[PDB]
Amino acid sequence: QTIQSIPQKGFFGHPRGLGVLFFVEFWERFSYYGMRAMLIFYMYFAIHQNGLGIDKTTAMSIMSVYGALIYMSSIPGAWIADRITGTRGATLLGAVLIIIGHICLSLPFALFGLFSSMFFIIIGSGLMKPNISNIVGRLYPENDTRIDAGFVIFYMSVNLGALISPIILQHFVDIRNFHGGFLLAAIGMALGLVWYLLFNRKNLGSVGMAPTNPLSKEEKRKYGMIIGIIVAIVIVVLLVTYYTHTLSFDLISNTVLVLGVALPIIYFTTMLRSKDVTDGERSRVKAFIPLFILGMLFWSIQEQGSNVLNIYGLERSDMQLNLFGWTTRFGEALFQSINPLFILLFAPVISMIWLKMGKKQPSLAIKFSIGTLLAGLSYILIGLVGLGYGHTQFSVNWVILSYVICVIGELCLSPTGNSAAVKLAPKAFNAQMMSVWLLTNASAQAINGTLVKLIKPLGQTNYFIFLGTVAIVITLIILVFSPKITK
Ligand SMILES: CCCCCCCC/C=C\CCCCCCCC(=O)OC[C@H](O)CO
Ligand SMILES: CCCCCCCC/C=C\CCCCCCCC(=O)OC[C@H](O)CO
Ligand SMILES: CCC[C@@](C)(CCO)SC[C@H](N)C(=O)NCC(=O)O
């Protein structure tokens, strides 16, 4: 038994291993969100400003495609752990690969340093992200009730890292020391790695030391050829286009757009066509399709606060926080700290609101609809502010209000999405249903990579109104079918 080799207490009434993984996750999320907060400015800021001088639209597209690839790579990353290395090996290789990606950004390698960093962090995150989560849950015995509270604690390390890192790295953006800031994220990530190496063995024991479903001799030969062919075609295409000078980011953004559309179709089709899935289990799968659209519409608007809403704030607002006499300069990277702060303050609050309502509480479909409508209302708000002022510079309080409306929507949607990938899940497709809730974000970010190209022809203000309205109309059309969706 994997529970015999591990302490069952030691970190706030939870297995001691939760403490080890909380410190490790904190530092990976701190360094990920810190690098992320800086990356957008580092890309489009001029060369004289220690930036890369990349086209603003291209820099915006990269942010979304990068985000989409991190979430898409968790699919093979969980498979690798499940069939080859185990979750422990995969978490460790991921962590090492992630540190390499952070070092790439610290060195003076310009565009090479940027794309090589993305490569190592995409691969590392796909290996580390789903596998650290798996280890956390496997620390609790079969009938253990603490498991849900254990994840609530684990995900606090995520938002604490996401909250603190933009506050720390705002200074490096201000003095234009990007390499110094990316080095700080690198060192932060090394602290996380050092802690795992020091404490993993006695606290986590045998948990995830081997793959659950290892590959046969003929399966190693089969998968090896298929992946070999796919990887080789990908390297050939990338190299041939490079030296012929037909290699642009559109090659990546279009490929990832295709992937963001195809993967959800492939997943829903496989589940609705399976012989092992019962008609009752099949009915819950089709019931998830509207929740997938609602989820996608939410993350499309939400994930745009990292590349669209922040540049708009920097360029159109006074960047001056002003609340009841308290006036201060607001650093552009601090826009990334808004959403994790509100999650930290009001996620336990909302959890009690639903618990007091009990069974009389709103359904999965209503909660998702509330969240998406709020995401759409946050874009109608900022769109109307720009329309109202025109060329006139407005208060950053407006841009901050847009972030606050969106995160209030996330508090409705997020605990509801995570609980849906297990409830509406068939017995054989539990890991596959885990992929569809993760794909609501991977697909939204994949659409975002191409969607950002509409800002120039439509106009930034018309773009917020158009995207805001589309979100609200689709939500209102789905909302009327909410009683039938609940199965
Ligand atoms: C550390 C992370 C950052 C946390 C940031 C603190 C959150 C502030 C909360 C709400 C925004 C203010 C209320 C909404 C705006 C009020 C309207 C306003 O300012 O009006 C301007 C003008 O005076 C008339 O048009
Ligand atoms: C928990 C529930 C949260 C509910 C969330 C509701 C969101 C409401 C949406 C949009 C309001 C738009 C207001 C209009 C924007 C202000 C325009 C403005 O100030 O215009 C400047 C004026 O023209 C002088 O120059
Ligand atoms: C609309 C919000 C966009 C955005 C920039 C959040 C606002 O601070 S997205 C990134 C955000 N820091 C985040 O998701 N971190 C928290 C987390 O991972 O849960």
Author numbering: 9 to 495
Sentences reproduced from the published study:
POT transporters belong to the Major Facilitator Superfamily (MFS) and use an inwardly directed proton electrochemical gradient to drive the concentrative uptake of di- and tri-peptides across the cell membrane for metabolic assimilation. We and others have demonstrated that S-Cys-Gly-3M3SH can be taken up and metabolised by a highly limited range of staphylococcal species present in the axilla, namely Staphylococcus hominis, Staphylococcus haemolyticus and Staphylocooccus lugdunensis, to liberate 3M3SH, that subsequently exits the cell through an undefined mechanism.
To gain further insight into the mechanism of substrate binding we successfully obtained a high-resolution co-crystal structure of PepTSh at 2.5 Å resolution, bound to S-Cys-Gly-3M3SH using the in meso crystallisation method. PepTSh adopts the canonical MFS fold with helices H1-H6 forming the N-terminal bundle and H7-H12 the C-terminal bundle. PepTSh was crystallised in an inward open state, observed previously for other members of the POT family, wherein the extracellular gate, consisting of helices H1-2 and H7-8 from the N- and C-terminal bundles respectively, is closed and the intracellular gate, consisting of helices H4-5 and H10-11 is open. Unlike previous POT structures however, PepTSh also contains a well-structured β-hairpin motif between helices H7 and H8 on the extracellular side of the membrane, extending out in line with the lipid head groups. Interestingly we observed a number of monoolein lipid molecules that cluster around both the β- hairpin and the cavity created between helices HA and HB with the transporter domain. The Cys-Gly part of the precursor is positioned such that the carboxy termini of the peptide faces towards the intracellular side of the binding site. The terminal carboxyl group makes two hydrogen bond interactions, one with Tyr41 on H1 and a second interaction to a water molecule (W107), which links the carboxyl group with Asn347 on H8. The carbonyl group of the CG peptide also makes a hydrogen bond to this water molecule, creating a well-coordinated interaction network between the peptide and Asn347.
